[PDB]
Design a protein around this ligand. Structure first.
Ligand SMILES: CC(=O)Nc1cn2cc(-c3cnc(N)c(C(F)(F)F)c3)ccc2n1
Length: 821
């Protein structure tokens, strides 16, 4: 159809990739996947409530914590010019919320966030946020949005052998290494005779392996590698395809080049055919356990996810697999003990999987679930049982792991998978999940050519069922970004190099922002990091180019909804991959919930940050906040010392009331404790004063994580100015509190060691490609003191605090001289 052509044209603009393209393929996997996702799309579209999808009530079933609990809490309903307070019991349905003492709904003031459905007000994420900061709950009696706006446009036994013709490069010795991989485990490997490196190196070599055709497991990768000795080029091909048929025929595969990882596992070939290297291949093919052994595997199950299993361990786990099955924590270890290169062994594991019973009855463990979704597991059925457990997560918990789950797709062998279908279902059901799903997929499609083909199919399938409302919303969202991306790169051409922001560039920037406003930007656009907020017109006078080396843009927007007078601030940055920052901030958000289960709040500030395109994205501006280095630069001198007194001086100046100051010191103790614990675990503690900020209310927060993780020592920044606020020159009543929170927070994280280990490794494998080392990943274990006693590990973190005390401003001065030398 004629309208069908305009629809795919609209979709592509929003995706950032033409899905219809069949140039960089050698199979129909992606088209089969495009058609395959039509059924679960229409399934979830036809299942979802139309009225509830339009309003998306953000509700948690998690209990109200002891710190937030401290009956009858008041709210203020608005309509016309009316403004009246109402005493509400925590257990009260919005439909039951007493106003007549009926088809009008209670909307949040300034936001699209709704207080709707059959759930208590104490269970709403908005009400809980207002109790955390200590803010008033303001509501508006508005007409519910019409679900008509959310309408969807209709419509043998022999040994395996591979023939290698040769290699061709457009521009001293070289050879091909062919590996058969299943869960990063090499089943068999053969190499070619090293011939001299030239534009055309031919061999005509039949590489016959030991593995039989029947023995080949579904999801096995033929990893072809070009050496010299060091690796230069890599390419993969699935030995058994998406139709369970074995691969046959000629293949001219374009390889990826190494620089110096999940990217190393991709089933996609290089798109740049003009510059990349090609490789031509040819295919034509029940008494139960004694006490000591019982104690032996009980110790094996008890070990961490990074502790390696030996042949002795693997053999014991397989022999006593039916005993192992009773323990759900043994499942990743047990499926790592499987001889995947044997059809008979694989067949036994499938029978073992049928008797899931206890696994299906187990209380959901996310750390255990995601361990089965990493690079070690290439089995469709093994991974399926993990996705099975993810179904029981309510939408709030799905949001918590959405970014990590989206990155986990890189570990799936085939494009169409149970996880890819799950993310699709969960996104199409809840508007908030769908919004972030769009931006998480768009970020990968824009700066990852190894995975853009797969993710684009997933995103297209989401957009095809999300509804015209969210579509004509993502359109005005992408528009704004592309326009601002064009403005930042223009300033960057005038902008240095060295050394400071021009007087003329800020006026030339304001002119470009005044030029753009007249015709380009729609009246309003939804904030990507915060979907509830609708930002309208620019405050051109409040806009500037930041002093930072990458020249980011300090933008200020007026709020579009009249129900809200403070501006919306966005930092637009080019030159860096913000996917790195996003991941740290998401772990920081997870750590906050880990402390919520232990009834602790360490006032962390994981600000809004979304990578929107290629090496460009946007950051939330935390209002009334300033840099630690800026405070030390305010009172005195050039550099160094860094007078202990200066930190408290700013806090006493930026707080009028002593009740507001003793609240500002109170907030600082918890935030400093939280950021010391978090950065120590993640291994990003040693920062520069410039990358650490504080609000006028005393809340401390770290910024620009890409700078540190994208590159004598101190384990976390705890300087004498921070110690001065506590009242220590020694120990004070506020310092006793600091160490008390520091230990309680560190030990609480240690009760979720397995989760923090798998989130960390998956982060280093999908987010940052130069860390990617067995040596780099093992850090998390040492920081989390894996194996040590609770009182022993307590003394370990307290000794880290004492290092920071014995180091003074030494490192800070050394950092100040470094960013100057
Ligand atoms: C009032 C104010 O200056 N607020 C403020 C500044 N600020 C700066 C950031 C920030 C975070 N990550 C970054 N990479 C940057 C950057 F602009 F690039 F330097 C800045 C985050 C929150 C934040 N809040």
């Amino acid at each position: 159809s004629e309208e069908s052509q305009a629809f795919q044209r609209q979709l592509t603009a929003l995706i950032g990739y033409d899905v219809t393209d069949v140039s960089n393929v050698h199979d129909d996997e992606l088209e089969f996947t495009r058609r395959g996702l039509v059924t679960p799309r229409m399934a979830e579209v036809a299942s979802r409530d139309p009225k509830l999808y339009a309003m998306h009530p953000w509700v948690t079933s998690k209990p109200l914590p002891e710190y937030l609990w401290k009956n009858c809490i008041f709210i203020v309903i608005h309509r016309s010019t009316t403004s009246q307070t109402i005493k509400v019991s925590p257990d009260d349905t919005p439909g039951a919320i007493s106003f007549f003492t009926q088809d009008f709904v209670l909307r949040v003031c300034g936001r699209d966030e709704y207080l709707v459905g059959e759930t208590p007000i104490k269970n709403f994420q908005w009400v809980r946020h207002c109790l955390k900061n200590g803010e008033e709950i303001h509501v508006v009696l508005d007409t519910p949005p019409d679900p008509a706006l959310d309408e969807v446009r209709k419509e043998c036994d022999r040994k395996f052998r591979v023939k290698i013709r040769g290699i061709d490069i457009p521009v001293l010795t070289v050879f091909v290494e062919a590996n058969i991989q299943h869960g990063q485990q090499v089943l068999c490997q053969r190499r070619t005779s090293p011939k001299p490196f030239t534009e055309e190196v031919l061999w005509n070599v039949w590489l016959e392996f030991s593995i039989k055709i029947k023995d080949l497991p579904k999801g096995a990768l033929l990893n072809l590698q070009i050496y010299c000795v060091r690796l230069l080029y890599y390419v993969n091909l699935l030995l058994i395809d998406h139709r369970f048929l074995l691969r046959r025929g000629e293949y001219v595969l374009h390889m990826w080049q190494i620089s110096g990882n999940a990217d190393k596992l991709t089933s996609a070939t290089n798109p740049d055919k003009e510059n990349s290297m090609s490789i031509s291949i040819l295919l034509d093919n029940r008494a139960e356990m004694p006490n000591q052994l019982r104690k032996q595997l009980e110790a094996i199950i008890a070990t961490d996810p990074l502790n390696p299993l030996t042949a002795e361990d693997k053999e014991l786990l397989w022999h006593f697999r039916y005993e192992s099955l009773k323990h759900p924590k043994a499942y990743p270890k047990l499926f790592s003990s499987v001889k995947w290169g044997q059809q008979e062994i694989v067949a036994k594991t499938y029978q073992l999987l049928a008797r899931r019973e206890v696994w299906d009855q187990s209380a959901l463990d996310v750390g255990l679930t995601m361990q089965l979704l990493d690079c070690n597991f290439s089995d469709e059925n093994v991974r399926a049982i993990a996705v099975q457990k993810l179904e029981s997560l309510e939408d709030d918990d799905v949001l918590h792991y959405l970014l990590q789950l989206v990155q986990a797709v890189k570990f799936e062998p085939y494009h169409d998978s149970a996880l890819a279908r799950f993310l699709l279902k969960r996104g199409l059901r809840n508007k908030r999940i769908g919004h972030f799903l769009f931006w998480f997929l768009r970020s990968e499609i824009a700066q990852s050519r190894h995975y853009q083909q797969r993710f684009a199919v997933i995103l297209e399938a989401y957009l095809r069922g999300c509804g015209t409302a969210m579509l004509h919303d993502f359109t005005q969202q992408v528009q704004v970004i592309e326009m601002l991306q064009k403005v930042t790169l223009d300033i960057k051409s005038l902008s240095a190099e060295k050394y400071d922001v021009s007087s003329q560039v800020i006026s030339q920037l304001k002119q470009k922002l005044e030029n753009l406003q007249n015709s380009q930007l729609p009246e309003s656009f939804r904030v990507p990091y915060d979907p509830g907020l609708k930002a309208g017109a620019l405050a051109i006078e409040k806009c500037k180019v930041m002093a930072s080396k990458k020249k980011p843009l300090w933008l200020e927007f007026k709020c579009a909804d009249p129900t809200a007078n403070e501006t919306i601030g966005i930092i637009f940055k080019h030159g860096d991959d913000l996917r790195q920052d996003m991941l740290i901030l998401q772990i920081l958000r997870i750590m906050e919930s880990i402390w919520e289960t232990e009834s602790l709040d360490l006032c962390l500030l994981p600000y809004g940050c979304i990578s929107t395109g290629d090496k460009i994205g946007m950051i939330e501006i935390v209002k009334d906040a300033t840099t630690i280095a800026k405070i030390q630069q305010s009172t005195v001198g050039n550099t160094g010392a860094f007078k202990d007194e200066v930190l408290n001086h700013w806090l006493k100046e930026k707080s009028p009331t002593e009740e507001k100051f003793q609240a500002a010191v109170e907030r600082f103790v918890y935030s400093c404790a939280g950021y010391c614990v978090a950065t120590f675990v993640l291994g990003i503690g040693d920062r520069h004063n410039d990358n650490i900020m504080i609000t006028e209310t005393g809340n401390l927060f770290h910024i620009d994580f890409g700078h540190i993780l994208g590159n004598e020592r101190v384990p976390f920044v705890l300087t004498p100015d921070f110690l001065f606020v506590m009242g220590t020159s020694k120990t004070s009543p506020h310092f006793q509190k600091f160490q008390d929170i520091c230990v309680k927070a560190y030990l609480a994280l240690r009760h979720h060691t397995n989760l923090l280990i798998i989130l960390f490794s998956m982060m280093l494998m999908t987010g940052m490609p130069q860390l990617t080392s067995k040596e780099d990943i093992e850090y998390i274990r040492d920081a989390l003191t894996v194996g040590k006693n609770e009182e022993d590990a307590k003394k370990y973190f307290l000794d880290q605090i004492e290092v920071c005390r014995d180091k003074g401003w030494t490192v800070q001065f050394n950092w100040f001289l470094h960013l100057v030398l």
